[PDB]
Design an enzyme around this catalytic site. Structure first.
Site, short mmCIF file in Angstrom:
data_model
loop_
_atom_site.label_atom_id
_atom_site.label_comp_id
_atom_site.label_asym_id
_atom_site.label_seq_id
_atom_site.Cartn_x
_atom_site.Cartn_y
_atom_site.Cartn_z
N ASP A 114 0.83 -1.20 0.00
CA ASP A 114 0.00 0.00 0.00
C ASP A 114 0.87 1.26 0.00
O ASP A 114 1.35 1.69 1.05
CB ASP A 114 -0.91 -0.02 1.24
CG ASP A 114 -1.81 1.18 1.32
OD1 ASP A 114 -1.95 1.90 0.31
OD2 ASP A 114 -2.41 1.38 2.40
N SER A 140 -0.63 15.58 -12.11
CA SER A 140 -0.88 15.21 -13.50
C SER A 140 -1.13 16.47 -14.32
O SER A 140 -1.67 17.46 -13.82
CB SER A 140 -2.09 14.26 -13.57
OG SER A 140 -2.50 14.01 -14.89
#
Length: 330
Positions: free
Chosen positions: A35, A199
Site C-alpha cells: 500500500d 498530473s
C-alpha cells in the site's frame, strides 16, 4: 541488494493485490497488500481477537526465534475507506522477493474492522508511503522500504500491476524489459506523507487532451481512480445511460456498454487506461448495472491514482533524497 516479488489480484475484479512476505525465523509467509498510501506493516496474528479472524494466515511471534516485543509500542490506523486496525508491535526479520530487512517493525493486530475480517485473502498490509505517516507510538517506526533503502542497489521500488493478471513489485532496480518507450519522471511532494504529484491533464476516449493540473497520490492500496467531479462527469457523459447513484455510492453504467479509454498526463507524456480497466462489473450478482472504475474524489479531500490508473503503467517510486515518480507505458 534487490528484491522481486509477484503480486496477484485477490479476485476477478482486481479489487486488491497480494504479495507473499516472509516474516520471522523460520519463515512465516503471509500475503500482504502493498500500500503506497500508508506506512504501517501490520498483520493478522496470534493476538488478533479470534472472532475477527476468518481464514487469514496469522503471524505467531512466539514461534519466531528472531521476534522481539517492541516494549510499550502500540499502533492504531484508520484508512480512507473507513476500515481500521490496531495492536502492539514486534521487531522481526522480514523478506520480500529475496530482499531481507532485519529489525523491521511488524505491527501485530489485536483488533481489525469488519472489512478486514471479511477478506480472507489479505493477511495484512505493507505500507510504502513515507515513514512520517507511520502510526506506532510513542516511537514512530520506518517502513520496509525506508529500512531497506541504504542496502538497495538504487533507492527505488517499482509497481507493475496486472490487469486481471499477476504483476511485479521490484526493489532496488528498474527492469528495463518491463515497459515500452521511456519513463517520464515527475516531481513529488512529501508534505502529506504520500507519493503526491501533479498530473498535467486528461482525455476521454479519442477526445482532445485537456491541459489542467490535477494534484493526487499514487496509491496501490486504493482500487479505483478518484478524480475531480468535473473530470469524472466528462468521462461518464460519454457512456450512454451512465449516472451517479447515491444509493449505490458512485457512477454506474449499463453492463451492455463499451467503455471509452481514459488518458492522464505525466509531464508531456500520456498514460492510456483502456476502457475495460474501468469496468468493475455488476453492482450485485445478476444485475445489469455495472460499477465504474473512475469515481469522484469530492468529499475525499484528495485525488487518488489508484490501481485502475497504476495498472496501466510501469511506475517507479524513486526514494532518492529528492523523491520523484516515474511512469512508462507497457
Amino acid at each position: 541488494s534487490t528484491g522481486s516479488a509477484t503480486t496477484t489480484p485477490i479476485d476477478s475484479l482486481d479489487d486488491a493485490y497480494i504479495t507473499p512476505v516472509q516474516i520471522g525465523t523460520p519463515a512465516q509467509t503471509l500475503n500482504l497488500d502493498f500500500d503506497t498510501g500508508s506506512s504501517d506493516l501490520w498483520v493478522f496474528s496470534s493476538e488478533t481477537t479470534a472472532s475477527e479472524v476468518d481464514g487469514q494466515t496469522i503471524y505467531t511471534p512466539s514461534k519466531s526465534t528472531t521476534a522481539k516485543l517492541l516494549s510499550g509500542a502500540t499502533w492504531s490506523i484508520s484508512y480512507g475507506d473507513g476500515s481500521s486496525s490496531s495492536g502492539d508491535v514486534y521487531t522481526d526479520t522480514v523478506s520480500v522477493g529475496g530482499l531481507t530487512v532485519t529489525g523491521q517493525a511488524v505491527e501485530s493486530a489485536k483488533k481489525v474492522s469488519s472489512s478486514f475480517t471479511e477478506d480472507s485473502t489479505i493477511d495484512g498490509l505493507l505500507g510504502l508511503a513515507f515513514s512520517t505517516l507511520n502510526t506506532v507510538s510513542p516511537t514512530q517506526q520506518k517502513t520496509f522500504f525506508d529500512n531497506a533503502k541504504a542496502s538497495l542497489d538504487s533507492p527505488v521500488f517499482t509497481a507493475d500491476l496486472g490487469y486481471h493478471a499477476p504483476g511485479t513489485y521490484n526493489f532496488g532496480f528498474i527492469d528495463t524489459t518491463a515497459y515500452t518507450g521511456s519513463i517520464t519522471y515527475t516531481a513529488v511532494s512529501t508534505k502529506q506523507g504520500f507519493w503526491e504529484w501533479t498530473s498535467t491533464g486528461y482525455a476521454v476516449g479519442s477526445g482532445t487532451f485537456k491541459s489542467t493540473s490535477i494534484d493526487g497520490i499514487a496509491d496501490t492500496g486504493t482500487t479505483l481512480l478518484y478524480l475531480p467531479a468535473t473530470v469524472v462527469s466528462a468521462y461518464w457523459a460519454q457512456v450512454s445511460g451512465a449516472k451517479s447513484s447515491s444509493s449505490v455510492g458512485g457512477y454506474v453504467f449499463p453492463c451492455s456498454a463499451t467503455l471509452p479509454s481514459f488518458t492522464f498526463g505525466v509531464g508531456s507524456a500520456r498514460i492510456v487506461i483502456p476502457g475495460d480497466y474501468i469496468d468493475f462489473g455488476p453492482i450485485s450478482t445478476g444485475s445489469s448495472s455495472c460499477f465504474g472504475g473512475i469515481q469522484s474524489s469530492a468529499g475525499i479531500g484528495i485525488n487518488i491514482f489508484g490501481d485502475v490508473a497504476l495498472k496501466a503503467a510501469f511506475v517507479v517510486f524513486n526514494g532518492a533524497t529528492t523523491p520523484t515518480l516515474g511512469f512508462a507505458s507497457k
